[PDB]
Design an enzyme around this catalytic site. Structure first.
Site, PDB file in Angstrom:
ATOM      1  N   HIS A  41      38.550  49.059  35.502  1.00 55.03           N
ATOM      2  CA  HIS A  41      37.577  49.954  36.536  1.00 55.03           C
ATOM      3  C   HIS A  41      38.977  51.189  37.436  1.00 55.03           C
ATOM      4  CE1 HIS A  41      39.251  46.456  39.267  1.00 55.03           C
ATOM      5  NE2 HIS A  41      38.967  48.097  40.815  1.00 55.03           N
ATOM      6  N   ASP A  90      38.411  44.367  31.705  1.00 47.23           N
ATOM      7  CA  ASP A  90      38.158  44.953  32.591  1.00 47.23           C
ATOM      8  C   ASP A  90      39.840  44.689  32.397  1.00 47.23           C
ATOM      9  OD1 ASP A  90      38.579  46.648  34.813  1.00 47.23           O
ATOM     10  OD2 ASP A  90      38.370  45.075  36.393  1.00 47.23           O
ATOM     11  N   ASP A 186      43.238  35.674  49.237  1.00 48.02           N
ATOM     12  CA  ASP A 186      42.951  35.937  47.742  1.00 48.02           C
ATOM     13  C   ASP A 186      43.183  37.452  47.555  1.00 48.02           C
ATOM     14  OD1 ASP A 186      41.437  36.473  46.393  1.00 48.02           O
ATOM     15  OD2 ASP A 186      39.294  36.861  47.171  1.00 48.02           O
ATOM     16  N   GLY A 190      41.898  47.126  46.181  1.00 48.80           N
ATOM     17  CA  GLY A 190      43.328  48.255  46.029  1.00 48.80           C
ATOM     18  C   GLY A 190      44.010  47.461  45.047  1.00 48.80           C
ATOM     19  N   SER A 192      43.319  45.975  42.400  1.00 46.74           N
ATOM     20  CA  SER A 192      43.607  45.197  41.193  1.00 46.74           C
ATOM     21  C   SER A 192      44.395  46.636  40.277  1.00 46.74           C
ATOM     22  CB  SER A 192      42.167  46.737  40.923  1.00 46.74           C
ATOM     23  OG  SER A 192      40.760  45.802  41.296  1.00 46.74           O
ATOM     24  N   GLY A 193      44.513  45.609  38.774  1.00 49.45           N
ATOM     25  CA  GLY A 193      45.328  46.338  37.994  1.00 49.45           C
ATOM     26  C   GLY A 193      47.146  45.127  38.233  1.00 49.45           C
TER      27      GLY A 193
END
Ligand SMILES: N=C(N)NCCC[C@H](NC(=O)[C@@H]1CCCN1C(=O)[C@H](N)Cc1ccccc1)C(=O)CCl
Ligand SMILES: OC[C@H]1O[C@H](O)[C@H](O)[C@@H](O)[C@@H]1O
Ligand SMILES: C[C@@H]1O[C@@H](O)[C@@H](O)[C@H](O)[C@@H]1O
Ligand SMILES: [Ca+2]
Ligand SMILES: [Ca+2]
Ligand SMILES: [Ca+2]
Ligand SMILES: [Ca+2]
Ligand SMILES: [Ca+2]
Ligand SMILES: [Ca+2]
Ligand SMILES: [Cl-]
Ligand SMILES: [Cl-]
Ligand SMILES: [Cl-]
Ligand SMILES: [Mg+2]
Ligand SMILES: [Mg+2]
Ligand SMILES: [Mg+2]
Ligand code: NA
Ligand SMILES: [Zn+2]
Ligand SMILES: [Zn+2]
Lengths: 254, 142, 191
Positions: A41, A90, A186, A190, A192-193
């Site tokens: 994504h 993803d 959590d 930003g 992500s990945g």
């Protein structure tokens, strides 16, 4: 990362900062000198495919030091089953144009064998997730690399302990939840990945990729990560494939 | 338990219940109060559940009420010490004791393997790096 | 597969066995156990039993709180169907075993009643530890004789009327408890 701590410089050596046109895009994980794993994504709004940069050895975004190594991203491979705007499948495998040099501050994370991952790593309670993402849901992003320790949950428990929300995505066999439902910690937008790394008998392994969530650190919800174990063969095969002309490659899955 | 000339003496717990097997009422005539007889009979007519020696592999039984507990030797477990810990060396059991990868071999011993950049140690279970910067290790700490 | 139900903890003197239903038809079970923040340990791999001995795991720290789960796998060999057990804190929940009166000695106009050391499954330094070694001051033994006496050790020094023959019975008790405070009565032993 909401509720985390600054990862001391050099202690998250496989963390990758992905940049597009020089702007901050996502995180990623170094798995060897040429390959980086990230989230699909992260590439949904990319138009300038020749302007993708991966930075290794990064720590403080406001200061450049001699440990940082930037490399152009040659190829971005994504499962063709992934649908932009959604959550399933993803994962993205990135080929760097030239290899990074392994140093005290740049070290790859082991991509593990599927069975070891499914029968062993999956039952290690805690794992670390890192990034330069938002420090609060809708808040500002971090200047120093952040890292958080999160406990993993089997999907049945995650479904049972998560507040009901209509229109929310299904948690599939290609995902897993990790985190806290008390609104304290959590991963966030930003991040992500970035890696969800698991320590087991002295060695760290890649088990998940920061993927999505219903708001960061929202009561009654956990962070949802990509279940990397479902992709070991797909990743290994593609790391053996020959270089292609275009940057983006939607490879079949499985 | 009745035997004519042996029934001339007065009540005795030792003679009728210890040396011989007495009924509920015989025991009741001895204690007289109901609750007293109750707690005597409760254990008296319970039976030794260890009499059948249910604890395998050299274990020890300790009788309880309508049950027992097996105390097992170090290498065994289970309600009856039936489980051999030495026959549990398989990959789903704490990674077969392997540091990195584990491979099941049914009929024979499991084998341990290592990730690229590492090699199997003397012990057949531990891994050691063959490169300067093996994956999954944080150099600045060591 | 079908999920296991009625998962129950059966524990006495720390010998802890998890039990469950149903009897498997074309399916096997695997049990996992953990402490709230620890890793899951597998036990009773692909068993057809509807029980699993977890004594060896819980005796590592009798004061920790454990949770177990029973995985259901189909015959032959994607997360499995499973069910979680009630949490279980051994020190606060294990049943106290039936005691046994070791002896009674008439030392003067008093009788000393000695309670046999109840052994548990906790085996510090090669030997099995007694209930008193584990509970300490949390454990007391009570005597019902003919009326009541209590002790902080395994002995009662009681007053008796010379040449009268009394009967005794003991019970292990953890007074701080609210649920499952005591053991079943020991067999009655008279003079
Ligand atoms: N709570 C968390 N741990 N969140 C991590 C979010 C990371 C973030 N991911 C995302 O933004 C992913 C991509 C698709 C939409 N999206 C989401 O996170 C969806 N907002 C989740 C959702 C939407 C609607 C209903 C229920 C849930 C990104 O960095 C690109
Ligand atoms: O041999 C096995 C059996 O032996 C006897 C025991 O009382 C019983 O409980 C057990 O199942
Ligand atoms: C663990 C068991 O304890 C009791 C002994 O009588 C057995 O031989 C065994 O040692
Ligand atoms: Ca910097
Ligand atoms: Ca008789
Ligand atoms: Ca007789
Ligand atoms: Ca009589
Ligand atoms: Ca009679
Ligand atoms: Ca009995
Ligand atoms: Cl380059
Ligand atoms: Cl989110
Ligand atoms: Cl004791
Ligand atoms: Mg006699
Ligand atoms: Mg009689
Ligand atoms: Mg009568
Ligand atoms: Na939360
Ligand atoms: Zn650095
Ligand atoms: Zn730079």
């Amino acid at each position: 990362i909401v509720g985390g701590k600054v990862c001391p410089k050099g202690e998250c050596p496989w963390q990758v900062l992905l940049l597009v046109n020089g702007a901050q895009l996502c995180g990623g994980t170094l798995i060897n000198t040429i390959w980086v794993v990230s989230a699909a994504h992260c590439f949904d709004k990319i138009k300038n495919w020749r302007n993708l940069i991966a930075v290794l050895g990064e720590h403080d975004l406001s200061e450049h030091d001699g440990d940082e190594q930037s490399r152009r991203v040659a190829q971005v491979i994504i499962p063709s089953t992934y649908v932009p705007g959604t959550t399933n499948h993803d994962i993205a495998l990135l080929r760097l144009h030239q290899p990074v040099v392994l140093t005290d501050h740049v070290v790859p994370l082991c991509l593990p064998e599927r069975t070891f991952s499914e029968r062993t790593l999956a039952f290690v309670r805690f794992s670390l997730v890192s990034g330069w993402g938002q420090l609060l849901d809708r808040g500002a992003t971090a200047l120093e690399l952040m890292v958080l320790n999160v406990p993993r949950l089997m999907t049945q428990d995650c479904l049972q302990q998560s507040r009901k929300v209509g229109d929310s995505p299904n948690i599939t066999e290609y995902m897993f939840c990790a985190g806290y439902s008390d609104g304290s910690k959590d991963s966030c937008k930003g991040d992500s990945g970035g890696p969800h790394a698991t320590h087991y008998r002295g060695t760290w392994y890649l088990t998940g990729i920061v993927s999505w969530g219903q708001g960061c650190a929202t009561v009654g919800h956990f962070g949802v990560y990509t279940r990397v174990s479902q992709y070991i063969e797909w990743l290994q095969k593609l790391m053996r494939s020959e270089p292609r002309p275009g940057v983006l490659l939607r490879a079949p899955f499985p | 338990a009745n035997a004519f000339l042996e029934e001339l003496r007065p009540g005795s717990l030792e003679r009728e219940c210890k040396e011989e097997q007495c009924s509920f009422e015989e025991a009741r005539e001895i204690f007289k109060d109901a609750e007293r007889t109750k707690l005597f009979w409760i254990s008296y007519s319970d039976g030794d559940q260890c009499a059948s020696s249910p604890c395998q592999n050299g274990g020890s039984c300790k009788d309880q009420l309508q049950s027992y507990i097996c105390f097992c030797l170090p290498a065994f477990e289970g309600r009856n010490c039936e489980t051999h810990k030495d026959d549990q060396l398989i990959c789903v059991n704490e990674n077969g004791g392997c540091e990195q990868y584990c491979s099941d071999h049914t009929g024979t011993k499991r084998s341990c393997r290592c990730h690229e950049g590492y090699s199997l140690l003397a012990d057949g279970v531990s891994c050691t790096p063959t490169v300067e910067y093996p994956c999954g290790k944080i150099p600045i700490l060591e | 597969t079908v999920a296991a139900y009625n998962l129950t903890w059966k524990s006495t003197n720390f010998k802890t066995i998890l039990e469950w239903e149903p009897k498997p038809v074309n399916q096997v079970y695997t049990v996992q156990i953990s402490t709230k923040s620890g890793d899951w340990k597998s036990k009773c791999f692909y068993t057809t039993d509807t029980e699993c001995d977890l004594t060896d795991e819980i005796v590592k720290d009798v004061k920790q709180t454990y949770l177990a789960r029973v995985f259901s796998y189909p015959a032959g060999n994607g997360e499995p169907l499973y069910e979680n057990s009630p949490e279980f804190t051994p020190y606060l929940e294990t049943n106290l075993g039936q005691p046994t009166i070791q002896s009674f000695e008439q030392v003067g106009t008093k009788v000393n009643v000695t309670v046999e050391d109840e052994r548990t499954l906790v085996r510090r330094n090669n030997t099995f530890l007694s209930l008193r070694d584990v509970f300490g001051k949390d454990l007391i033994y009570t005597l019902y004789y003919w009326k009541t006496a209590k002790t902080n050790t395994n002995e009662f020094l009681i007053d008796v009327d010379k040449g009268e023959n009394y009967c005794f019975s003991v019970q292990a008790v953890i007074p701080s408890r609210t649920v499952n405070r005591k053991s079943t009565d020991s067999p009655v032993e008279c003079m």
